[model samples]
Target: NVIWSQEFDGESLDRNVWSYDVGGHGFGNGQLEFNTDRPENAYLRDGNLVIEARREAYGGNAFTSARIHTRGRFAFQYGDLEARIKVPDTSDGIWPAFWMLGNNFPGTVWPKCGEADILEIGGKDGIAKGLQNRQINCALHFAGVGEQKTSLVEWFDAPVDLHLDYHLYKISWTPTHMKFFLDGKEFGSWDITASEMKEYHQPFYPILNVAVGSWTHSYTGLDTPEKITATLPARMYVDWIRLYGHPETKLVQN
Candidate 1:
């Protein structure tokens, strides 16, 4: 059963559920865009939430984009979370993502709270191999047994061009494990029943964003400003986001 959802309907974005992550700190990835809350960078249009990454000089950054999240407003511990979206031609440095982070953040640092990236594109491997359209990724990051940081990325393939149309990127998350899916077809799953993976059993909030560049030039192949081959304004669209079957999970406590 679908318990909660957002269709990105009407003319304005619902502020009650989404809070912006505004900054030019590259969000730890050396991204080129200065994320903003402005409607020009993020707005609701024709039943979709639009996140536009543009080439502009703003806030001491060379580009502008948007990142919004459902933090204190809404969070689920276990559910089938999915988003339908259309990505930009990330042939340049574009990095579009739909992901989640444990609600335990803010007071806690990362790698300690857990993170799940439902979808990500514009990888260095894909760009170098010329399979940008066919390749996508899902990832998990969590604290290892000790203070160590550990992460896993699963690369998935789509027979269609992800940039040309909207497709479902989903994850069936439970107390013990998580499974990845593309258009409802399962591709991978992992066990998180161990103590080191305890963070996954807690609540997490979702995030949507479109970024440019990366410190290592790993996530996005744009190492230099000249590598931005995308059109001046590149956009990512979210048709909807839904969480199905959260019967046993608890809403995050603020």
Candidate 2:
């Protein structure tokens, strides 16, 4: 039976199923520095969970945003994890990701423990910004594997405003494989039994974050003072999270 679902409604997050990511670093991928604890970084308003990314100084850093996860509070091995979210637009160095990392990463880091990017949007108009169409981006990190590959190179090709449209992003995971979906449409899949399962077990918990600037940002001309001057506040909104699995559960107020 699946445990429960987390809907970012009400006033705060569900302590029993969710947790906040503090600090600016530790996100890896040489991400920009920012604050993750500010109310502007995370909040539940108007029946939705909003994670805003702004170009302002916080925690002695240059910007601030949010990263929410369910590592210890809620972890599922095999089930369907779904969320209705609006992603921020591609701007000067913004990277928003809905991904997962192994729960047992206290001793190990990265590929070894495995990382699955269920939904990732490299800043539009930035280096690596190829999603001219509303295609969903995905990647798998594993040891011994030189680099992660995109299964659906150009899966999302539509006039969908991920930031404006309340679209569903889902991932169905089992011992044998992991499949990605957008609005019930299949776009990506990975066979876990081959190399991922042997190196990492128990799968991974969830992580939803909004990042600004990185190596890719520099490469794509997305990270520039001129671009930042044009866009100040880039926000992403989430409607809810739904889980389908054993011991099925319903949505809970955060």
Candidate 3:
């Protein structure tokens, strides 16, 4: 029951489905990448969407990459969100993710707006390589009583090296709960029928990106600039992204 999809088959990223979050303010993760929409950082290659994270000085930032989303362009309430991707293999720092945010976004702040981290790989020592690279996580974030932030997460271990191949990461969401899947294998699920969990019942847009390190320490574990030992121009490739029975999807990027 496919509702919407981006196959990256065109000559360029269809502006209708994606947009870039430019600049380098760490994006609340103390990340180092100066996100750009430039072809060097993001582009369509061999039927895949490539997000290249580079070690370089750009736009007053130490590194550069791409953070694209379907904010203003598209959104959905409950459905199956999935993607086929091949992550970068590095002993260094990189945080790659496939996640979602409430479309009401600016209308409501984070936690209140709700977030679903469908697939997240790499962080600090959680570098993508060998055993570590085979690990992934999914979580839900939202505001709790008195606006206090709350989150629930679960990790998954793949049978193969995630960096060496493309895997299907998915989240099946309904009004009552959400389930996580890697290559159609279920790993975890959660009930979201609480009053505080109302955020999950609304529309959400998807986001894709890779982060290097933050100011103090990156979630990917590159604390100091010296700890950032990954190879230059690390890339995360997306074969395709699809949503089923959802989204009045317009593919808007912000």
Candidate 4:
């Protein structure tokens, strides 16, 4: 099948491309407070898509952020997906992610259905401090036998201060293999055939969000009112996203 892509308009995120993730409760990892919905959390401006996280009392929670996704709206089987984005810099208790999951997940949860963390960064705890910036991460999460959860991470020598510059995070997926790249350079790969390959059947969807005060931030002793106040409002900017096919390869710029 041919690849398709759409850019985020500065005025607003296309309703057809993204929908708000609204809820007051956290399921995975048992996040204490339920994330609230607010315009401050997500918006489009200055020709870019912004997903902001703020530290404020809302819906009985002290933090707020936005989660945008394409589930019933759009899905893809195998294609080269890339997004040009600039991550938030305010350190301590922030979590930013660009990920995907099988559309069939409504019946299954987390690693059971399948997950592809195309790009995930931020968090001040061991997972964060231990991870070197300027690198890429790729994984094939599954729940079936013979093919559980597996991941490949590459640490970059250069520091990745997401607040400073824009970077392209990309993933190339084929029927047999999947590869993750940063700025067009190959970083890691996974062979689907090595496993059962059932997870690859369902169409996958995209999700972007910025979470605050999670285990990574709290356990690391970075989730403090003072530190969070200093960076009360941090923003994540996404420039464009493109999808391409391998056979008739072409860049779909937004």
* Winning model by lDDT: 1
lDDT of 1: 0.87
Cα-based lDDT for every prediction: 0.87, 0.66, 0.83, 0.67
Model 1: lDDT of residue 205 = 93
The per-candidate count of clashes, in order, stands at 0, 9, 9, 1
TM-score of 2: 0.82
* Candidate 3 whole-model C-alpha lDDT, 0 to 1: 0.83
Q: Identify the runs in model 2 with alpha carbons over 4 angstroms from their true place.
A: 1-3, 124-133, 145-155, 217-230, 246-254
Estimate, for each residue in 1-254, the C-alpha lDDT of model 3 and write its tens digit: 77678999977998877878998888887787899989999999999999999888898888889999988888888888899999887556777889999999968988799999998877544544445587788998899777789979887778887888889999998877989999999888999998878888888999999888665554565655577777778899999998877443333333
> Which candidate should be chosen as best, given TM-score against the real structure?
1
Error of 4 at 11 (Å): 1.4
Write candidate 2's Cα lDDT for 95-206 as tens digits.
7778887776656766677677778775454233455325457666666445443232324554565656778888887767778888898778877787525653464678
Q: What TM-score, to 2 decimals, does candidate 3 have? A: 0.92
Ranking by TM-score: 1, 3, 4, 2
Tens-digit per-residue lDDT, 1-254, candidate 1: 87788999989898888899999887888888999999989999999999999999999988999999999999998889999999988885888999999898976799787899988988888888888877888899988778588988888778887999998989998877899899889876889898788888888999999998887646885755677787759889899998887678675534
Worst 10 residues of 3 by lDDT: 245-254
**Cα displacement (Å) at residue 237, model 3:** 1.1
Model 2's number of clashes is: 9
Runs in model 4 with CA error above 4 Å? 30-37, 124-136, 146-160, 216-230, 247-254
Q: Candidate 4: lDDT of 215?
A: 39
User: Predictions ranked by lDDT, top down?
Assistant: 1, 3, 4, 2
> Among all windows of ten consecutive residues in candidate 1, which has the lowest summed lDDT?
245-254
For model 4, how does the per-residue alpha-carbon lDDT over 1-254 read when each residue is reduced to its tens digit? 33676566657677766777776465453232245445678877877888887767777667678888878777777788899888876455566778888887778776767788877654443234554233334556676565565444543433455458888888888877778887888777877775566686557888888766543323223443444422658788898777776773422222
